[PDB]
Amino acid sequence: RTTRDDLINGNSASCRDVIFIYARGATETGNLGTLGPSIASNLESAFGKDGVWIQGVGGAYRATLGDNALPRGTSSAAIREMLGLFQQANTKCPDATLIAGGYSQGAALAAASIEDLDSAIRDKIAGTVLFGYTKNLQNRGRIPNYPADRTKVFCNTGDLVCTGSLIVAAPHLAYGPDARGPAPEFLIEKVRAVRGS
Numbered sequence: 060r061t062t063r064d065d066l067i068n069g070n071s072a073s074c075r076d077v078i079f080i081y082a083r084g085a086t087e088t089g090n091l092g093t094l095g096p097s098i099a100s101n102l103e104s105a106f107g108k109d110g111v112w113i114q115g116v117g118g119a120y121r122a123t124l125g126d127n128a129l130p131r132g133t134s135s136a137a138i139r140e141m142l143g144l145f146q147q148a149n150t151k152c153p154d155a156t157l158i159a160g161g162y163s164q165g166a167a168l169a170a171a172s173i174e175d176l177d178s179a180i181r182d183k184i185a186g187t188v189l190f191g192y193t194k195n196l197q198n199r200g201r202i203p204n205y206p207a208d209r210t211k212v213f214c215n216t217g218d219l220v221c222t223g224s225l226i227v228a229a230p231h232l233a234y235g236p237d238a239r240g241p242a243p244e245f246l247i248e249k250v251r252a253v254r255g256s
Contacts (some may be wrong), residue, residue: 077250079102092115098238102158116165166191169189185253192220196222
């Protein structure tokens, strides 16, 4: 299903070890959209249902297509919403390892949020995956203030948003295989690198 609010609904007395916060692309449904559920099922298989909390960015994030043209590639209200979720994870589950991801506008949102996040929380994000990263060229494939080794960008050849454009071509809608395999593989590897087991 396209809606997951595990962090908001979760009991602090029984925090998951891993918390995944994900932002969907433009016009997508629920708070996970088309790629989020595939990543979620694979994380659940690796850490178990009670070992990982899946949280989509909903609330003020309406994933409005036109917001791709704003300075940071998304709206201020959306950034405030995602920042709030990272802050809620940090207070509710101080010992949890965080992971994040975003697709299209959601990738710009993830990058903007992580850049603004206070360092103590940002440093808890073991890995971040970005699909069809709209600010790929502008940010030179990086998320500002965040290490390259913890970042994985999936940008298809021919996906114009990865080369500085806002045009949506067919390759931008072809990240399904990545969400099913390499993306969760990267996230799992980065969590295990710091948590062991």
